[PDB]
Amino acid sequence: GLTIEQVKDINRRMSIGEAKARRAKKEMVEANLRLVISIAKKYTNRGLQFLDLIQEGNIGLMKAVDKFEYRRGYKFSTYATWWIRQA
DNA sequence: CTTGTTATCCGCTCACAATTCCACACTAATTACGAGCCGGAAGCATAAAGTGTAAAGCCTTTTTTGCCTAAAATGTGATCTAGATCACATTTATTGCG
């Protein structure tokens, strides 16, 4: 129900906001890889290998960083490790 | 003097255990719990057309039974001729020999 010319304008500016945020979150999911292996000692030999253990650990950190609020009393080193041990 | 290829050396990843049967005896650790949720099935009686089972109800055919009796098979024993029986004693005829 939109013009083929203007419909592109809506999406072209969405790739700008998601890009400035994506690259900005690539620095938090790289310097915090030490916390993933830290709590990865509670689910070692059980049924899944260690190589596939930090798999659900890295995906969890990338989820918490997105739903994180710097304007909140709780820090990140505690709020992020919540979704990690959940995956 | 500097440069190259080549030879020797090392540590490394790599490929690589072969005399031949059986018997007896023995053996395993670990991820926080509780409340709420949807799940399968506990096997419940239901009910129907459909199916295949299970009583025994008179017919017909087979098979054992008891039957009757007309006609054929079956002892009676004392006398009497045609038959049989043993053992191993002595007499007889067979083919040749000389």
PDB file of C-alpha atoms (C1' of nucleotides) in Angstrom:
ATOM      1  CA  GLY A   1       0.000   0.000   0.000  1.00  0.00           C
ATOM      2  CA  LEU A   2       3.031   2.259  -0.341  1.00  0.00           C
ATOM      3  CA  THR A   3       4.975   3.820  -3.211  1.00  0.00           C
ATOM      4  CA  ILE A   4       7.842   1.683  -4.513  1.00  0.00           C
ATOM      5  CA  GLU A   5      10.054   4.775  -4.319  1.00  0.00           C
ATOM      6  CA  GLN A   6       9.271   5.809  -0.740  1.00  0.00           C
ATOM      7  CA  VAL A   7       9.097   2.264   0.636  1.00  0.00           C
ATOM      8  CA  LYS A   8      12.866   2.024   0.176  1.00  0.00           C
ATOM      9  CA  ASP A   9      13.388   5.158   2.269  1.00  0.00           C
ATOM     10  CA  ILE A  10      11.946   3.442   5.345  1.00  0.00           C
ATOM     11  CA  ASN A  11      14.347   0.493   5.231  1.00  0.00           C
ATOM     12  CA  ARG A  12      17.456   2.355   4.057  1.00  0.00           C
ATOM     13  CA  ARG A  13      17.510   4.308   7.324  1.00  0.00           C
ATOM     14  CA  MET A  14      16.948   1.203   9.450  1.00  0.00           C
ATOM     15  CA  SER A  15      20.264  -0.256   8.299  1.00  0.00           C
ATOM     16  CA  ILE A  16      21.932   2.866   9.690  1.00  0.00           C
ATOM     17  CA  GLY A  17      20.608   2.561  13.235  1.00  0.00           C
ATOM     18  CA  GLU A  18      21.225  -1.177  13.461  1.00  0.00           C
ATOM     19  CA  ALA A  19      24.774  -0.750  12.157  1.00  0.00           C
ATOM     20  CA  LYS A  20      25.797   1.904  14.680  1.00  0.00           C
ATOM     21  CA  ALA A  21      24.498  -0.334  17.469  1.00  0.00           C
ATOM     22  CA  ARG A  22      25.767  -3.659  16.120  1.00  0.00           C
ATOM     23  CA  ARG A  23      29.416  -2.615  15.861  1.00  0.00           C
ATOM     24  CA  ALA A  24      29.048  -0.889  19.232  1.00  0.00           C
ATOM     25  CA  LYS A  25      28.044  -4.205  20.802  1.00  0.00           C
ATOM     26  CA  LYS A  26      30.874  -6.121  19.128  1.00  0.00           C
ATOM     27  CA  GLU A  27      33.246  -4.679  21.728  1.00  0.00           C
ATOM     28  CA  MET A  28      31.252  -6.090  24.644  1.00  0.00           C
ATOM     29  CA  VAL A  29      30.879  -9.605  23.241  1.00  0.00           C
ATOM     30  CA  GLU A  30      34.630  -9.881  22.672  1.00  0.00           C
ATOM     31  CA  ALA A  31      36.237  -8.443  25.805  1.00  0.00           C
ATOM     32  CA  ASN A  32      33.867 -10.463  27.987  1.00  0.00           C
ATOM     33  CA  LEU A  33      34.740 -13.923  26.669  1.00  0.00           C
ATOM     34  CA  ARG A  34      36.573 -14.585  29.936  1.00  0.00           C
ATOM     35  CA  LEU A  35      33.323 -14.663  31.913  1.00  0.00           C
ATOM     36  CA  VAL A  36      31.884 -17.323  29.607  1.00  0.00           C
ATOM     37  CA  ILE A  37      34.578 -19.892  30.388  1.00  0.00           C
ATOM     38  CA  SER A  38      34.483 -18.895  34.059  1.00  0.00           C
ATOM     39  CA  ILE A  39      30.988 -20.246  34.725  1.00  0.00           C
ATOM     40  CA  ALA A  40      31.581 -23.019  32.187  1.00  0.00           C
ATOM     41  CA  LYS A  41      33.004 -25.188  34.969  1.00  0.00           C
ATOM     42  CA  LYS A  42      29.587 -26.051  36.399  1.00  0.00           C
ATOM     43  CA  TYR A  43      28.358 -27.989  33.365  1.00  0.00           C
ATOM     44  CA  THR A  44      31.458 -29.890  32.249  1.00  0.00           C
ATOM     45  CA  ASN A  45      31.318 -33.686  32.012  1.00  0.00           C
ATOM     46  CA  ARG A  46      27.583 -34.407  31.943  1.00  0.00           C
ATOM     47  CA  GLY A  47      26.400 -35.127  28.409  1.00  0.00           C
ATOM     48  CA  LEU A  48      27.761 -32.396  26.153  1.00  0.00           C
ATOM     49  CA  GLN A  49      31.370 -31.677  25.187  1.00  0.00           C
ATOM     50  CA  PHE A  50      33.187 -28.513  26.270  1.00  0.00           C
ATOM     51  CA  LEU A  51      33.508 -27.285  22.684  1.00  0.00           C
ATOM     52  CA  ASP A  52      29.712 -27.157  22.488  1.00  0.00           C
ATOM     53  CA  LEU A  53      29.484 -25.889  26.066  1.00  0.00           C
ATOM     54  CA  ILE A  54      30.576 -22.293  25.486  1.00  0.00           C
ATOM     55  CA  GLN A  55      28.279 -22.362  22.456  1.00  0.00           C
ATOM     56  CA  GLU A  56      25.205 -21.570  24.545  1.00  0.00           C
ATOM     57  CA  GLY A  57      27.427 -19.313  26.637  1.00  0.00           C
ATOM     58  CA  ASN A  58      28.410 -16.940  23.844  1.00  0.00           C
ATOM     59  CA  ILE A  59      24.886 -16.710  22.432  1.00  0.00           C
ATOM     60  CA  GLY A  60      23.606 -15.776  25.885  1.00  0.00           C
ATOM     61  CA  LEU A  61      26.079 -12.932  26.324  1.00  0.00           C
ATOM     62  CA  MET A  62      25.036 -11.478  22.968  1.00  0.00           C
ATOM     63  CA  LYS A  63      21.423 -11.494  24.164  1.00  0.00           C
ATOM     64  CA  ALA A  64      21.990  -9.804  27.523  1.00  0.00           C
ATOM     65  CA  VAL A  65      24.077  -7.019  25.984  1.00  0.00           C
ATOM     66  CA  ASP A  66      21.103  -6.159  23.770  1.00  0.00           C
ATOM     67  CA  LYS A  67      18.573  -6.057  26.609  1.00  0.00           C
ATOM     68  CA  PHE A  68      21.017  -4.305  28.939  1.00  0.00           C
ATOM     69  CA  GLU A  69      20.316  -0.904  30.490  1.00  0.00           C
ATOM     70  CA  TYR A  70      23.180   1.319  31.649  1.00  0.00           C
ATOM     71  CA  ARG A  71      20.578   3.454  33.420  1.00  0.00           C
ATOM     72  CA  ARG A  72      19.893   0.591  35.828  1.00  0.00           C
ATOM     73  CA  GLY A  73      21.385  -0.037  39.267  1.00  0.00           C
ATOM     74  CA  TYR A  74      22.443  -3.565  38.344  1.00  0.00           C
ATOM     75  CA  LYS A  75      25.781  -3.929  36.553  1.00  0.00           C
ATOM     76  CA  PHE A  76      26.598  -5.980  33.455  1.00  0.00           C
ATOM     77  CA  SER A  77      28.942  -8.574  34.958  1.00  0.00           C
ATOM     78  CA  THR A  78      25.937  -9.873  36.899  1.00  0.00           C
ATOM     79  CA  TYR A  79      22.984  -9.285  34.573  1.00  0.00           C
ATOM     80  CA  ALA A  80      24.726 -10.874  31.586  1.00  0.00           C
ATOM     81  CA  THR A  81      25.752 -14.077  33.368  1.00  0.00           C
ATOM     82  CA  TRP A  82      22.059 -14.723  34.028  1.00  0.00           C
ATOM     83  CA  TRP A  83      21.098 -15.582  30.449  1.00  0.00           C
ATOM     84  CA  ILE A  84      24.393 -17.405  29.907  1.00  0.00           C
ATOM     85  CA  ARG A  85      23.810 -20.093  32.535  1.00  0.00           C
ATOM     86  CA  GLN A  86      20.220 -20.312  31.294  1.00  0.00           C
ATOM     87  CA  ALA A  87      21.122 -21.356  27.749  1.00  0.00           C
TER      88      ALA A  87
ATOM     89  C1'  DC B   1      84.117 -11.696   0.819  1.00  0.00           C
ATOM     90  C1'  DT B   2      79.306 -13.174  -0.126  1.00  0.00           C
ATOM     91  C1'  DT B   3      76.542 -16.264  -1.923  1.00  0.00           C
ATOM     92  C1'  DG B   4      74.492 -20.620  -3.243  1.00  0.00           C
ATOM     93  C1'  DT B   5      73.182 -25.668  -2.924  1.00  0.00           C
ATOM     94  C1'  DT B   6      74.093 -29.714  -0.327  1.00  0.00           C
ATOM     95  C1'  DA B   7      74.980 -32.934   3.592  1.00  0.00           C
ATOM     96  C1'  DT B   8      74.109 -34.046   8.420  1.00  0.00           C
ATOM     97  C1'  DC B   9      71.587 -33.425  12.151  1.00  0.00           C
ATOM     98  C1'  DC B  10      67.783 -32.865  15.226  1.00  0.00           C
ATOM     99  C1'  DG B  11      63.009 -33.062  16.999  1.00  0.00           C
ATOM    100  C1'  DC B  12      58.817 -34.176  15.249  1.00  0.00           C
ATOM    101  C1'  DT B  13      54.582 -36.303  13.306  1.00  0.00           C
ATOM    102  C1'  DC B  14      53.951 -40.224  11.670  1.00  0.00           C
ATOM    103  C1'  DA B  15      52.802 -45.269  10.800  1.00  0.00           C
ATOM    104  C1'  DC B  16      52.344 -49.181  13.213  1.00  0.00           C
ATOM    105  C1'  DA B  17      52.299 -55.111  18.341  1.00  0.00           C
ATOM    106  C1'  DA B  18      51.474 -62.536  14.919  1.00  0.00           C
ATOM    107  C1'  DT B  19      53.519 -68.873  19.169  1.00  0.00           C
ATOM    108  C1'  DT B  20      48.888 -72.195  19.620  1.00  0.00           C
ATOM    109  C1'  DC B  21      43.475 -74.134  22.999  1.00  0.00           C
ATOM    110  C1'  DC B  22      40.844 -74.104  27.665  1.00  0.00           C
ATOM    111  C1'  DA B  23      39.430 -73.778  32.858  1.00  0.00           C
ATOM    112  C1'  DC B  24      38.509 -71.171  37.769  1.00  0.00           C
ATOM    113  C1'  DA B  25      37.470 -66.474  40.224  1.00  0.00           C
ATOM    114  C1'  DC B  26      36.056 -61.093  40.526  1.00  0.00           C
ATOM    115  C1'  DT B  27      33.933 -55.688  39.203  1.00  0.00           C
ATOM    116  C1'  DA B  28      31.434 -48.536  38.679  1.00  0.00           C
ATOM    117  C1'  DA B  29      31.200 -41.617  40.491  1.00  0.00           C
ATOM    118  C1'  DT B  30      28.329 -36.746  39.074  1.00  0.00           C
ATOM    119  C1'  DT B  31      24.357 -30.709  37.276  1.00  0.00           C
ATOM    120  C1'  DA B  32      19.464 -26.881  43.786  1.00  0.00           C
ATOM    121  C1'  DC B  33      14.064 -27.304  44.413  1.00  0.00           C
ATOM    122  C1'  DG B  34       9.261 -26.103  44.096  1.00  0.00           C
ATOM    123  C1'  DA B  35       4.853 -24.539  41.802  1.00  0.00           C
ATOM    124  C1'  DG B  36       2.120 -24.674  37.678  1.00  0.00           C
ATOM    125  C1'  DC B  37       1.160 -26.606  33.294  1.00  0.00           C
ATOM    126  C1'  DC B  38      -0.494 -29.796  29.427  1.00  0.00           C
ATOM    127  C1'  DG B  39       0.025 -34.340  28.328  1.00  0.00           C
ATOM    128  C1'  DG B  40      -1.356 -39.441  27.723  1.00  0.00           C
ATOM    129  C1'  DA B  41      -4.329 -43.004  28.878  1.00  0.00           C
ATOM    130  C1'  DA B  42      -6.932 -45.769  33.701  1.00  0.00           C
ATOM    131  C1'  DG B  43      -9.772 -48.662  31.091  1.00  0.00           C
ATOM    132  C1'  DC B  44     -15.192 -46.577  31.939  1.00  0.00           C
ATOM    133  C1'  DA B  45     -19.688 -48.049  29.654  1.00  0.00           C
ATOM    134  C1'  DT B  46     -21.570 -47.075  25.540  1.00  0.00           C
ATOM    135  C1'  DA B  47     -23.483 -48.823  20.911  1.00  0.00           C
ATOM    136  C1'  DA B  48     -23.782 -50.255  16.367  1.00  0.00           C
ATOM    137  C1'  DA B  49     -23.126 -53.140  11.870  1.00  0.00           C
ATOM    138  C1'  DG B  50     -20.491 -56.263  11.188  1.00  0.00           C
ATOM    139  C1'  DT B  51     -18.316 -60.422  11.812  1.00  0.00           C
ATOM    140  C1'  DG B  52     -17.270 -65.145  13.506  1.00  0.00           C
ATOM    141  C1'  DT B  53     -18.723 -68.519  17.947  1.00  0.00           C
ATOM    142  C1'  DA B  54     -21.211 -71.370  20.544  1.00  0.00           C
ATOM    143  C1'  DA B  55     -25.821 -73.786  22.676  1.00  0.00           C
ATOM    144  C1'  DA B  56     -28.381 -78.042  20.817  1.00  0.00           C
ATOM    145  C1'  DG B  57     -33.435 -78.585  17.331  1.00  0.00           C
ATOM    146  C1'  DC B  58     -35.211 -82.508  14.087  1.00  0.00           C
ATOM    147  C1'  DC B  59     -33.495 -84.794   9.711  1.00  0.00           C
ATOM    148  C1'  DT B  60     -30.683 -88.537   6.937  1.00  0.00           C
ATOM    149  C1'  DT B  61     -26.932 -91.532   6.761  1.00  0.00           C
ATOM    150  C1'  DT B  62     -23.475 -95.126   9.323  1.00  0.00           C
ATOM    151  C1'  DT B  63     -22.738 -98.202  12.370  1.00  0.00           C
ATOM    152  C1'  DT B  64     -23.112-102.083  16.466  1.00  0.00           C
ATOM    153  C1'  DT B  65     -26.394-104.393  18.538  1.00  0.00           C
ATOM    154  C1'  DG B  66     -29.833-108.105  19.556  1.00  0.00           C
ATOM    155  C1'  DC B  67     -32.680-110.709  17.023  1.00  0.00           C
ATOM    156  C1'  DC B  68     -35.059-115.206  14.307  1.00  0.00           C
ATOM    157  C1'  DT B  69     -34.556-119.456  12.222  1.00  0.00           C
ATOM    158  C1'  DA B  70     -33.956-121.782   7.347  1.00  0.00           C
ATOM    159  C1'  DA B  71     -30.478-124.426   5.809  1.00  0.00           C
ATOM    160  C1'  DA B  72     -25.791-126.342   6.319  1.00  0.00           C
ATOM    161  C1'  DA B  73     -22.186-128.081   9.509  1.00  0.00           C
ATOM    162  C1'  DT B  74     -21.231-131.293  13.354  1.00  0.00           C
ATOM    163  C1'  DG B  75     -19.994-135.445  17.522  1.00  0.00           C
ATOM    164  C1'  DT B  76     -22.190-140.332  19.599  1.00  0.00           C
ATOM    165  C1'  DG B  77     -18.482-144.895  19.848  1.00  0.00           C
ATOM    166  C1'  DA B  78     -17.779-149.703  18.787  1.00  0.00           C
ATOM    167  C1'  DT B  79     -15.971-152.549  14.399  1.00  0.00           C
ATOM    168  C1'  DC B  80     -13.808-152.928  10.543  1.00  0.00           C
ATOM    169  C1'  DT B  81     -10.747-152.838   6.439  1.00  0.00           C
ATOM    170  C1'  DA B  82      -6.853-150.007   4.053  1.00  0.00           C
ATOM    171  C1'  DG B  83      -3.239-147.185   6.225  1.00  0.00           C
ATOM    172  C1'  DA B  84       0.600-145.752   9.048  1.00  0.00           C
ATOM    173  C1'  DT B  85       5.462-146.250  12.623  1.00  0.00           C
ATOM    174  C1'  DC B  86       9.770-147.081  14.694  1.00  0.00           C
ATOM    175  C1'  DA B  87      15.133-149.341  14.954  1.00  0.00           C
ATOM    176  C1'  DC B  88      19.404-150.504  12.361  1.00  0.00           C
ATOM    177  C1'  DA B  89      19.717-156.494  10.410  1.00  0.00           C
ATOM    178  C1'  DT B  90      20.630-158.199   6.500  1.00  0.00           C
ATOM    179  C1'  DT B  91      20.109-158.358   1.485  1.00  0.00           C
ATOM    180  C1'  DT B  92      19.935-156.133  -2.807  1.00  0.00           C
ATOM    181  C1'  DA B  93      21.206-153.831  -7.426  1.00  0.00           C
ATOM    182  C1'  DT B  94      23.987-149.596  -9.334  1.00  0.00           C
ATOM    183  C1'  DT B  95      27.752-148.091 -12.340  1.00  0.00           C
ATOM    184  C1'  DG B  96      33.182-150.161 -13.475  1.00  0.00           C
ATOM    185  C1'  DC B  97      38.172-152.767 -12.382  1.00  0.00           C
ATOM    186  C1'  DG B  98      40.987-156.035 -13.806  1.00  0.00           C
TER     187       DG B  98
END
